[model samples]
Target: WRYGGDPPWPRVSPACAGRFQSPVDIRPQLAAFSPALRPLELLGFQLPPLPELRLRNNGHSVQLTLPPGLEMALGPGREYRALQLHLHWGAAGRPGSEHTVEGHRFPAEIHVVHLSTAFARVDEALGRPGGLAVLAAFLEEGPEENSAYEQLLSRLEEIAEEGSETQVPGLDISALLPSDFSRYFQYEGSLTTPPCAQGVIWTVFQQTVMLSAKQLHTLSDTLWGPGDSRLQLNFRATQPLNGRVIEASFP
Candidate 1:
């Protein structure tokens, strides 16, 4: 395994060759219902104005670091605190979503990553089971621009360049979430990004959040990679699910 070339993933990290991979194409028709699954409880996902927010473009993605107090508990004791959220997108016309359903891809995918309170250190958390919980939602194009996206997209120009950051606050983070989190595809998988760390409990929603043309344009048109014209195709390809079962909350 070589060390360069913009992460020639799958083959880049030797560990990526493992079985618990993420971004699998979810086939709801085939998902099984297991009583082990429980409805998620979201605490403080709606409010903001917690002093300030650090919005930054790390070249890899546009990320929002959450403040303390925002927590998401999957089931009972499987609680994880909100760490950050980021987006994976495609170009203007191409489908860029990482996870697909019934072989269909959306315009984008947003990952709300959380770390389990079981581990204080983020590093240790990523290496163990039930240590990370990621709420993934697909973003589809809609008839009109979504007002919920206004606060974030409006400030895109400020962090257009890589490493650029801005203090954004008073936004309703829940507005970015799907209206119905009641149904989702849950599985044990790895991080979609490099290192491809396993043990992440992935919850991909069935319903999508809608956004307008102009709102999407800002994300696709403005953000750019380091020394590049624009940041194009910032999503990973769907990986094969060797022998894993995708459980449904409402199957």
Candidate 2:
């Protein structure tokens, strides 16, 4: 299915129709639970260090090298594969944020969705149970002095069109990570998008990265299309918790 298009598949349940979908406000659902969730120990799990990703100025979306141990974690009897990484943002007036803090939204968000590559065919993993695991990161406005993210931000000028692609020089993706890696929120939820496939393990960081207002404006100006462009806003609203529990490493 194409990103931002009507979900190619049929809607199966209420989860698919619900508004307050995930990558949205999850605090309410998290707060409703009385039992505190357990912490996630990421000590031994080897994560693939960020690798250089290059996307020529084609219409195709960017492809990335999956880091080690970056496979999907489908629950019992299920498996997930690695897929491409994409981003979400807010419109000009409203800030683009996926995960909300106590009903508050951040400036931007990124999601690297991995499917179970173990399947014989990539299409086989689609619409199947336990087929996706998504790693999510939230971005706050950064300072004008920090050039670490400049490379990625600068490329927007070339591939700002909805489907445009450009060759991005290889840069360490890990640099985007926050200093406090130990704290995060985790839970089982549907793809924040349509068809709302369940079984996704969302790893959302509690710590936010900084971006200068100039950087935010640059991203908006470069990526947004003229008059009601699809790039204007790509975030899905928050979804219902549906009795699900959110686990975090923070005290």
The best candidate by TM-score is: 1
- lDDT (tens digit, per residue) of candidate 1 on 108-213: 8889999998889789887699889899999989998888777888988999988899998867787898877677889899987778889989999888999887
Query: CA shift at 215, candidate 2, in angstroms?
Result: 1.2
lDDT of 2 by residue, 15-129 (tens): 6654323664657445433234343222212333344454432222223444444443433434454455655666566777777878887777767677665566545654554
Name the lDDT value of residue 37 in candidate 1.
71
- Misplaced by over 4 Å in model 2 are 1-15, 18-21, 28-52, 56-82, 117-122, 127-130, 224-230
The TM-score values for the models, in the order shown, are: 0.93, 0.72
Candidate 2: worst-modelled 10 consecutive residues by lDDT: 40-49
**Per-model lDDT:** 0.82, 0.58
In angstroms, the error of model 2 at 199 is 1.1
